[PDB]
Design a protein around this nucleic acid. Structure first.
Length: 377
RNA sequence: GUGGAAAGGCGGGCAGAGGCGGUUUGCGUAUUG
């Protein structure tokens, strides 16, 4: 297949590491507006200075620093998003979406990193009796992975910026020759270098709006303002596997993922079929796991029961996907105390350690919708 | 009322042929002051 289009079922924020200060914004109505400082500042000179360089650096009481253009001028906006929520007293930092010409698209590095989490989950399920024969070749540390006994039961005690997944990515994707440690990752040995995803077509201005993300898990909830693609927008993305790049590397790949493909048939032929069966088994499993916790908001469960009977492949993206959806640690729930000492080793809570709500405490949902759901087919 | 007189060290010759700046890594998560 080529040009496998998608749709959007919840708010979806792909960050760019940038926020809109209140000098960029003046909401005249329930609609909001993104003013053009470079053009507006250079357009407010004809009527005259050094006052703009003094007032913007001062940041006084925002509202008046954007409504002072209303005196003898008006109508200087760029994008003019919608607020779509009962907020905005400016006092906000709207996190902006990634845009190529002021037009929102989905980056392909972000949809590949979600498939890579789904594919990593499938490799650690099926592959401890076969995980030693992978590291039997030029690693010599599989005896430690055999005496502990499913390499996960060793890695909880093996650990006991952050390079925590360094060995686990080197077992499922790329066995190296040697290192100062036991093994390391080699980018030249990877089936995922044959997985080609591309940036999608740009979404559109009509489907972009500001949101009001409330954080739930504490008695005092906090709001975060953010912009995200509204649910119901459908764009098209093309994903294909280059099978010719796997035929050349039939002897050079050394990993547990390659030892999941030689059992479904020809390993350069079933990798694209293994790929989506890994998607609908990581993300349906994190979909069912969130029906256990009812701390959110009621209506959240009526979204999750409606995610079933929906054709296509369902997966998370973006910013509101929690620790449960960007991490192997869905599989590390069934350990309990084997992961309880290690979750405090890294540490989590700050400003000692969170005892009973260590990992799953935060839920970031926009307008009562669990954000970040995109369904391919 | 000179061991002198005259006599180009030079005519021809591409530092050339082959070679991907490359492979993996989701602007995000954690909690409060």
């Amino acid at each position: 297949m080529t040009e496998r289009t998608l749709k959007v079922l919840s708010p979806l924020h792909i960050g760019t590491g940038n926020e809109l200060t209140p000098v960029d914004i003046y909401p005249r109505e329930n609609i909001i507006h993104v003013l053009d400082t470079e053009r507006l500042v250079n357009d407010l000179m004809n009527l005259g200075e050094l006052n703009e360089i003094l007032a913007l650096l001062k940041n006084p009481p925002a509202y008046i620093w954007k409504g002072y253009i209303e005196e003898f001028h008006l109508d200087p906006s760029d994008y003019s998003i919608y607020t779509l929520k009962i907020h905005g007293r400016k006092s906000m930092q709207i996190k902006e979406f990634i845009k190529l010409n002021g037009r929102p698209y989905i980056p392909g590095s972000s949809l590949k990193g979600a498939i890579r989490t789904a594919v990593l989950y499938k490799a650690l399920k099926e592959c401890d009796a076969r995980a030693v024969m992978r590291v039997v070749s030029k690693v010599n540390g599989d005896v430690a992975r055999d005496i502990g006994r499913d390499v996960l039961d060793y890695y909880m005690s093996f650990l006991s910026r952050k390079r925590a997944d360094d060995l686990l990515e080197a077992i499922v994707f790329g066995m190296e020759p040697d290192r100062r440690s036991k093994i390391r990752y080699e980018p030249k040995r990877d089936p995922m270098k044959a997985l080609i995803v591309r940036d999608s077509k740009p979404v559109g201005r009509k489907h972009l709006a500001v949101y009001h993300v409330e954080v739930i898990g504490n008695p005092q909830p906090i709001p975060i303002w953010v912009e995200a693609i509204e649910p119901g927008a459908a764009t098209d993305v093309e994903i294909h596997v280059d099978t010719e790049a796997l035929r050349l590397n039939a002897d050079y790949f050394n990993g547990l993922l390659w030892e999941c493909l030689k059992e479904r048939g020809e390993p350069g032929e079933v990798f694209e079929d293994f790929l989506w069966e890994a998607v609908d088994e990581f993300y349906t499993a994190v979909m069912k796991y969130e029906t256990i916790e009812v701390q959110k908001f009621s209506q959240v469960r009526s979204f999750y029961a409606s995610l079933e009977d929906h054709s296509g492949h369902v997966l998370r993206l973006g910013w509101g996907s929690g620790w449960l959806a960007m991490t192997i640690g869905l599989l590390l729930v069934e350990k309990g105390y084997k992961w309880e000492n290690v979750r405090k080793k890294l540490g989590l809570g700050k400003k000692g350690s969170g005892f009973s709500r260590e990992f799953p405490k935060t839920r970031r949902l926009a307008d009562g919708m669990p954000m970040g759901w995109v369904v391919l087919e």
